[PDB]
Amino acid sequence: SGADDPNYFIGIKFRHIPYEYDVKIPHLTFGVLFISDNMIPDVVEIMKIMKKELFEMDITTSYTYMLSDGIYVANVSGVLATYFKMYNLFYKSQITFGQSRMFIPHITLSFSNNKTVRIESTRLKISSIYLRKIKGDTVFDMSE
């Protein structure tokens, strides 16, 4: 029953984001995972298998919203084919991915309450994709 809460996330950084933000490193939280420490290489292998598709994603954004009290975020659109493919790859290797109940991919903008904004659908340009410990450090990064 239930699941181990995630201890890592896959992040995606962009050349530019089209919103005011207060966080120091704005990024898409693409997915969350629980990884046993002996399983880091397995996760890295899967990210490398998926590298070209990840970098090819047609990622857009168009609105912001309060995820919860004091967490203001932007949406993304266009990542779900890859998201669910990755869910499947991690599952086949018995790695717990996407086990958070309320998790939906998002770009956190500010840890404060903000009014919603809407802009024209705006294409984001991926600069880096990385694996980072939640409340910890990055352990793997790729570009191109």
Tab-separated table of C-alpha atoms in Angstrom, residues 24-95:
chain	number	residue	atom	x	y	z
A	24	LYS	CA	16.548	31.462	-7.413
A	25	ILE	CA	16.590	28.627	-9.944
A	26	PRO	CA	13.337	28.424	-11.888
A	27	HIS	CA	12.825	25.047	-13.505
A	28	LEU	CA	10.232	22.588	-14.658
A	29	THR	CA	9.816	19.801	-12.113
A	30	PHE	CA	9.224	17.179	-14.791
A	31	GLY	CA	8.884	14.175	-12.518
A	32	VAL	CA	9.550	12.881	-9.026
A	33	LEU	CA	11.056	9.566	-7.961
A	34	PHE	CA	12.148	7.492	-5.064
A	35	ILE	CA	15.556	6.064	-5.811
A	36	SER	CA	17.440	3.618	-3.611
A	37	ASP	CA	21.084	4.716	-3.621
A	38	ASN	CA	22.180	1.598	-5.501
A	39	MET	CA	19.695	2.561	-8.227
A	40	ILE	CA	21.093	5.941	-9.325
A	41	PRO	CA	22.891	4.403	-12.324
A	42	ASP	CA	19.659	2.741	-13.431
A	43	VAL	CA	17.839	6.074	-13.391
A	44	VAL	CA	20.696	7.773	-15.208
A	45	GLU	CA	20.635	5.046	-17.883
A	46	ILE	CA	16.927	5.614	-18.443
A	47	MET	CA	17.395	9.368	-18.699
A	48	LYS	CA	20.100	8.791	-21.312
A	49	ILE	CA	17.861	6.400	-23.259
A	50	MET	CA	15.207	9.119	-23.238
A	51	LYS	CA	17.583	12.016	-23.853
A	52	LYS	CA	16.748	12.782	-27.472
A	53	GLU	CA	13.001	12.591	-26.879
A	54	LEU	CA	13.226	14.756	-23.745
A	55	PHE	CA	15.188	17.429	-25.592
A	56	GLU	CA	12.721	17.237	-28.494
A	57	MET	CA	9.636	17.929	-26.362
A	58	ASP	CA	7.344	20.688	-27.580
A	59	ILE	CA	6.998	22.402	-24.217
A	60	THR	CA	4.757	25.429	-23.922
A	61	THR	CA	3.321	27.399	-21.045
A	62	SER	CA	0.404	29.796	-20.835
A	63	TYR	CA	-0.865	30.277	-17.290
A	64	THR	CA	0.037	30.367	-13.619
A	65	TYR	CA	-1.822	29.107	-10.581
A	66	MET	CA	-1.593	28.453	-6.857
A	67	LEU	CA	-0.542	24.834	-6.399
A	68	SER	CA	-1.050	25.203	-2.663
A	69	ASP	CA	-0.865	27.978	-0.090
A	70	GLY	CA	2.405	29.818	-0.674
A	71	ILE	CA	3.386	27.852	-3.811
A	72	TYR	CA	2.788	29.770	-7.041
A	73	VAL	CA	3.602	27.931	-10.260
A	74	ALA	CA	3.348	27.946	-14.048
A	75	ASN	CA	1.803	25.207	-16.152
A	76	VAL	CA	3.503	23.301	-18.924
A	77	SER	CA	1.876	21.664	-21.894
A	78	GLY	CA	3.287	19.047	-24.232
A	79	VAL	CA	5.299	16.696	-22.018
A	80	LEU	CA	2.808	13.917	-21.239
A	81	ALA	CA	3.664	11.405	-24.003
A	82	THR	CA	7.223	11.435	-22.698
A	83	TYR	CA	6.151	11.617	-19.060
A	84	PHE	CA	4.107	8.434	-19.341
A	85	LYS	CA	6.737	6.678	-21.441
A	86	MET	CA	9.222	7.404	-18.666
A	87	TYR	CA	6.758	6.216	-16.047
A	88	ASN	CA	6.686	2.910	-17.939
A	89	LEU	CA	10.480	2.660	-18.280
A	90	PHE	CA	11.029	3.309	-14.594
A	91	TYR	CA	8.286	0.813	-13.711
A	92	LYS	CA	9.877	-1.907	-15.859
A	93	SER	CA	13.111	-1.382	-13.891
A	94	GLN	CA	11.175	-1.354	-10.571
A	95	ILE	CA	11.911	2.303	-9.872
